[PDB]
Design a protein around this ligand. Structure first.
Ligand code: UJV
Ligand code: UJV
Length: 440
């Protein structure tokens, strides 16, 4: 059966009171009316986001009391024969003061992007609150009147413009909801039918997400069938709001030609390249930041924060399980080398270089060392990092130049990957120590 709450229960006994929009609001309404910039479908995800916020505010306050929880739901209704789309939620609602004084910005301008007029009913969840009707056609006036039959929460009826009638088709609205609003955290219904929505596990505290939940989400966001070999659930609130999960696949890398971008569980970009550095394009997963608006200073800042955190994560993994990290470096190490070569900043080159692992003349065959570990073994008076590129360890060890160096205890990195020469040429130095090939 169907489950709908939207219907014409409201009535207004008296006359409305007329108010004039304040000057800046009127100016923004003028921009909307004249704007041809028309990613028009966005109003739906903003209204759903505001409904979700209103529901959470109610739920938290009732839980802070001993109070039972009512039905907390978001409903959409389309009406083709009347050219409307309606959203209604059973959240905290608005007082008359807020309807006159006042998120209320974002829901407002995008509604008037698609509306000839907007008809709102709201009733605060506070006990003894009255219901109100708010009306505007986007001119400099709005109307408010006390209304009977308003359900606690907020209902917004958008009377669509003649060129926006597509949003009174159920199938069109269904697709918009699924595209941008699939992870809304309260039950969502369209025309009485429950929408298939998913759990935004990146918002949970990382200690609460189980491996089976990560495996299901990884397979979903990567459209994969393996499991992730690594999982980084990164939550921070400074300098930026970040709720993110990053996976690296169990399978090897073609992946050589990403990460979805959200803002409080609202999709911004399905496949947001530019959010990670190019060399991290093998990462799958999701990044959610409240701080999001396009080659902005903010995106650059988020990218640099995430790069540092992922490098730290991989360093941490090498300490937790060196054998698993060595396999990761074997499988994904060409991305690290690419990043060193293409990086502009020396500090970024050296940060990525902390992930490189090489054999060494000082270690058993097959055992790997990092550049930092090599540096900690350098003997006083010797101030450079020496390496030798060769096809295998036997050929490196029988270099006449290495053999001579053995006499004075100098460690030499043994590098067997064909792109090691270019990587270490471009790195040039590490921790103020020049990288020098022992053969020219
Ligand atoms: C904690 O944050 C809170 C705290 C309390 C909150 C109450 N809220 C609402 O009652 C509400 C507002 C919208 C909305 O987008 N608009 C846009 C309008 C334009 C003109 C006139 C209007 F009445 C409009 C409303 C949609 C659904 C909602 O439930 C949201 C909240 C969010
Ligand atoms: C172990 O410590 C040492 C100590 C000394 C070392 C010298 N080493 C050399 O490889 C070397 C270079 C040259 C030279 O003049 N070259 C090499 C060129 C290659 C390309 C283009 C050019 F123009 C070149 C000019 C001559 C003899 C050499 O043995 C490794 C060393 C290692």
């Amino acid at each position: 059966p169907l489950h709908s709450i939207i219907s014409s229960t409201e009535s207004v006994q008296g006359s409305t009171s007329k108010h004039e929009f304040q000057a800046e609001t009127k100016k923004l309404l003028d921009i909307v009316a004249r704007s041809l910039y028309s990613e028009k479908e966005v109003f739906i995800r903003e209204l759903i986001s505001n409904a979700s916020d209103a529901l959470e505010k109610l739920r938290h306050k009732l839980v802070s009391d001993g109070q039972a929880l009512p039905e907390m739901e978001i409903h959409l209704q389309t009406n083709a024969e009347k050219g409307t789309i309606t959203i209604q939620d059973t959240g905290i609602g608005m007082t008359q003061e807020e309807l006159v004084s006042n998120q209320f910005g974002v829901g407002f301008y995008s509604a008037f992007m698609v509306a000839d007029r907007v008809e709102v009913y709201s009733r605060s969840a506070a006990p003894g609150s009255l219901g109100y009707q708010w009306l505007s056609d986007g001119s400099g006036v709005f109307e408010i009147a006390e209304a009977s039959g308003v359900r606690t929460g907020t209902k917004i009826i958008i009377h669509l413009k003649s060129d926006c009638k597509e949003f009174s088709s159920e199938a069109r609205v269904r697709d918009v909801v699924t595209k941008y609003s699939n992870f809304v955290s309260f039950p969502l219904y369209l025309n009485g039918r429950r929408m298939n929505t998913l759990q935004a596990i990146w918002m949970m505290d990382p200690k609460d997400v189980r491996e089976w939940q990560h495996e299901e989400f990884y397979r979903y966001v990567a459209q994969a069938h393996d499991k992730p070999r690594y999982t980084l659930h990164y939550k921070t609130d400074a300098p930026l709001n970040i709720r993110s999960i990053f996976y690296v696949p169990d399978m090897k890398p073609m992946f050589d030609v990403s990460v979805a971008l959200y803002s409080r569980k609202v999709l911004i970009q399905t496949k947001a390249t530019d959010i990670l550095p190019k060399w991290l394009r093998f990462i799958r997963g999701v990044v959610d930041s409240e701080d999001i608006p396009q080659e902005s200073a903010l995106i650059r800042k988020l990218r640099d924060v995430l790069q540092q955190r992922l490098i730290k994560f991989f360093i941490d993994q090498s300490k937790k399980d060196a054998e698993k990290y060595a396999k990761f470096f074997e499988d994904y190490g060409l991305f690290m080398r690419e990043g060193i070569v293409t990086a502009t900043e020396q500090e970024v080159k050296e940060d990525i270089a902390k992930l490189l692992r090489y054999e060494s003349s000082a270690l058993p065959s097959g055992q790997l060392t990092s550049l930092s570990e090599y540096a900690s073994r350098m003997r006083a008076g010797t101030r450079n990092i020496y390496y030798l590129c060769a096809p295998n360890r036997h050929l490196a060890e029988h270099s006449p130049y290495y053999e001579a160096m053995k006499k004075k205890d100098t460690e030499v990195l043994f590098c067997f990957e064909q792109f090691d020469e270019l990587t270490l040429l471009h790195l040039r130095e590490f921790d103020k120590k020049k990288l020098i090939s022992v053969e020219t």
